[PDB]
């Protein structure tokens, strides 16, 4: 849980990092904006899934939630039996002029299955004419970069999210 919560930099939400690893000092940090545990409380194989998302999309990291993040980037089963921890990282993951390192998938043909990771950057074919690998009419690159800035609002500030699955 050392580098899990205190890594130098986190990965994108579409390329979310998965690591195989006392849940009391973690809860008593008194610095996490979201510590929502589903099924099992923190007091009562472990997968640690780390990524960075936007502030207002944290509510999409709950079971049974719609949205682009859940549909195309990171989906959780309705029978989730872990915990979701999210905390603001405006000082770390934002810089003057914008921080365009973090990306997310915006377009897909179908929704992600639970605990699925997709990395292929195949050109989205919205229309009927084939894209042929060239961006154009009805042809869009599926990955978009977050525009994290220090002066953004709370709902647009970077948020580091770690999911513990038991």
């Amino acid at each position: 849980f050392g580098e899990v919560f205190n890594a130098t930099r986190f990965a994108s939400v579409y390329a979310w990092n998965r690591k195989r690893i006392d849940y009391s000092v973690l809860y008593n940090s008194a610095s996490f904006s979201t510590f929502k545990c589903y099924g099992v409380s923190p007091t009562k194989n472990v997968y640690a899934d780390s990524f960075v998302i936007r502030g207002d999309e944290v509510r999409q990291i709950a079971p049974g939630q719609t949205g682009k993040i859940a549909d195309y980037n990171y989906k959780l089963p309705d029978d989730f039996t872990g915990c979701v921890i999210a905390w603001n990282s405006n000082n770390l993951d934002s810089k003057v002029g914008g921080n365009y390192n973090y990306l997310y998938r915006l377009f897909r043909k179908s929704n992600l299955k639970p605990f699925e990771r997709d990395i292929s950057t195949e050109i989205y074919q919205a229309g009927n004419t084939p894209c042929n690998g060239v961006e154009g009419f009805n042809c869009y690159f599926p990955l978009q970069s977050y525009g994290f800035h220090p002066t953004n609002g709370v709902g647009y500030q970077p948020y580091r999210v770690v999911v513990l699955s038991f």
Binding site: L106, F107, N128, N138, Q144, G147, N152, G153, V154, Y156
Partner: protein, 597 residues
């Protein structure tokens, strides 16, 4: 793979791309405004050019999606907003000519300065210049000289340019499937595709004329009272059965009658309610004023301002340390970034202006949850109305006493109420006929009802039969009086102010009824009224996704404009004026002139 899904995907891409291309431009403009350096100017220009190029490319891309095969109203509205090509419909040469004409007219207006023959070397600009004379001077000859000089230079300079501008704008509007440019302006109120809420462009003229006809008697009584007080001020220049001269209306164009207050004050012994001295005595700062405004908006029910508002806003004046123009402006930079820029000082006027801009920012925060394109007022006359109703709520004596700014033993004498009502009348009622006249003249000039050789004649006939104002000096066809105004020569619509006033009073009456206020409408305070806040927010969160008629019905229960709230706001003043106008002729004769009488 249908057209609906293709358009939805295109808008999905465009909403995400538009953000941070508008945010960078907003940041550059904010840096330029707060910190005036050449590098900031270049950065702002580059960001604006990049955003404009992105917008034009997106419009070109969106023009390939037909609206016939679209069934969703929101998608159709967004594609209508984006596909609009405007001046790009004309040829490159026509576009260059139109841009050159517009820039030349703007430069002629800004740099224009009349100079007396006695000393051509030193002479007065427009600001403050002739405006100070028109606001403060009591000299008939000086006012007439300033008026006639400004006309004879500016209108003569802008006449052929305005004619070419009219021709080019008519061509552009016709190329965009419109009857004329006036139809293009009236298109901002068009509602279609919605059952029970449709609004036609031709309905706007009818509605404006009906409301003006309903307003006319109050304006007639106010005009008679102002004429009586002016004859008191000017003994042998103003006839008691005729119109008023155009150079004695308190400002340059007769747009507002506020500066006439000192001449037309009912009870000069009784003073106005000014709390500047109390604010100084209590050691109030700009942060304190904005905190009280935020407290008022929290009390009415709307949420409090974000932390970034209190950390990135220029609520004060930095000084000579860094230059910054501080016209009071509410900024919505995007991505949940809201700011206010103004040199707030210790003054009641700054207090009301702070509440006004705070209401603007609250409205922006309310509709910020909508898709990018649908992030404006339902029509062009809602932001200002919301700000003005906030100002009216903050200006009431009840609010002043409640916040600890007026002594509890203050007696609200009815003379003070009459004085306040007459000041509000001079500010509000005296500009509606001018706005209606100017918009009607421009509309029928664009239509073609007025030939090029009847512009000035018809303009002055409208002045005489509608506004009740007579020109002091005869004019000819080499003059262009409307071009002397900023909006006319800078390509700006003008009916927004009329509609804004009507919406203002409708909203005020609706919220006062919701707030359970008993008594006059001018003594109403929506403070501590959570239901009024609920209704207001329910209207504000729609943005421009829903027709403005739907939002108007949400607030006041009526689908169209109405002047009954405006007439109800001024009822005590109307009765008082009727009492004072018992022995005076109410009306005017459109024959008398200062030169032909």
């Amino acid at each position: 793979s249908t057209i609906e899904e293709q358009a939805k995907t295109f808008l999905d891409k465009f909403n995400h791309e538009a953000e941070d291309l508008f945010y960078q431009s907003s940041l550059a403009s904010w840096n330029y405004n707060t910190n005036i350096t050449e590098e900031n100017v270049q950065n702002m220009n580059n960001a604006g050019d990049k955003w404009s190029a992105f917008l034009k490319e997106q419009s070109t891309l969106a023009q390939m999606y037909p609206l016939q095969e679209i069934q969703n109203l929101t998608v159709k509205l967004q594609l209508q907003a984006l596909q609009q090509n405007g001046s790009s419909v004309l040829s490159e040469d026509k576009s260059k000519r139109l841009n050159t004409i517009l820039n030349t007219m703007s430069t002629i207006y800004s740099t224009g300065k009349v100079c007396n023959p006695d000393n051509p070397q030193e002479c007065l600009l427009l600001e403050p210049g002739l405006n100070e004379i028109m606001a403060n001077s009591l000299d008939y000859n000086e006012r007439l000289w300033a008026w006639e000089s400004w006309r004879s230079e500016v209108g003569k300079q802008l006449r052929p340019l305005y004619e070419e501008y009219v021709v080019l704008k008519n061509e552009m509007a016709r190329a965009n499937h419109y009857e004329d440019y006036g139809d293009y302006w009236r298109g901002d109120y068009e509602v279609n595709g919605v059952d029970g809420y449709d609004y036609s462009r031709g309905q706007l003229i009818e509605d404006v004329e009906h409301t003006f006809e309903e307003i006319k008697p109050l304006y007639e009584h106010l005009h008679a009272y102002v004429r009586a007080k002016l004859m008191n001020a000017y003994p042998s220049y103003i006839s008691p059965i005729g119109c008023l001269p155009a150079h004695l209306l308190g400002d340059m164009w007769g747009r507002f009658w506020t500066n006439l207050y000192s001449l037309t004050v009912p009870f000069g012994q009784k003073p106005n309610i000014d709390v500047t001295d109390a604010m100084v005595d209590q050691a109030w700062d700009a942060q304190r004023i904005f905190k009280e405004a935020e407290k008022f908006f929290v009390s009415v029910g709307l949420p409090n301002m974000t932390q970034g508002f209190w950390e990135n806003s220029m609520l004060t004046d930095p000084g000579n340390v860094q230059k910054a123009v501080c016209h009071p402006t509410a900024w919505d930079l995007g991505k949940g970034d809201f700011r206010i820029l103004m040199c707030t000082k210790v003054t009641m006027d700054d207090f009301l202006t702070a509440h006004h801009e705070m209401g603007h920012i609250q409205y922006d925060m309310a509709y910020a949850a909508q898709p990018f394109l649908l992030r404006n007022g339902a029509n062009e006359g809602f932001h200002e109305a919301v700000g003005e109703i906030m100002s009216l709520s903050a200006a009431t004596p009840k609010h002043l006493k409640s916040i600890g700014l007026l002594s509890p033993d203050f007696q609200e004498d009815n003379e003070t109420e009459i004085n306040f009502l007459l000041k509000q009348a001079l500010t509000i009622v005296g500009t509606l006929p001018f706005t209606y006249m100017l918009e009607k003249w421009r509309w029928m000039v664009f239509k073609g009802e007025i030939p090029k050789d009847q512009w000035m004649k018809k303009w002055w006939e409208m002045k005489r039969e509608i506004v009740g104002v007579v020109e002091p000096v005869p004019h000819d066809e080499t003059y262009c009086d409307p071009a002397s105004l900023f909006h006319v020569s800078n390509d700006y619509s003008f009916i927004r102010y009329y509609t804004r006033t009507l919406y203002q009073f409708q909203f005020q009456e609706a919220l006062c009824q919701a707030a359970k206020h008993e008594g006059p409408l001018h003594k109403c305070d929506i403070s501590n009224s959570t239901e009024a806040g609920q209704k207001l927010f329910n209207m504000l969160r729609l943005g421009k996704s829903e027709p403005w008629t739907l939002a108007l019905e949400n607030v006041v229960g009526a689908k169209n404009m109405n002047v009954r709230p405006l007439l109800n706001y001024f009822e005590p003043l109307f009765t008082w004026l009727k009492d004072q106008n018992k022995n005076s002729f109410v009306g005017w004769s459109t024959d008398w002139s200062p030169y032909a009488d």
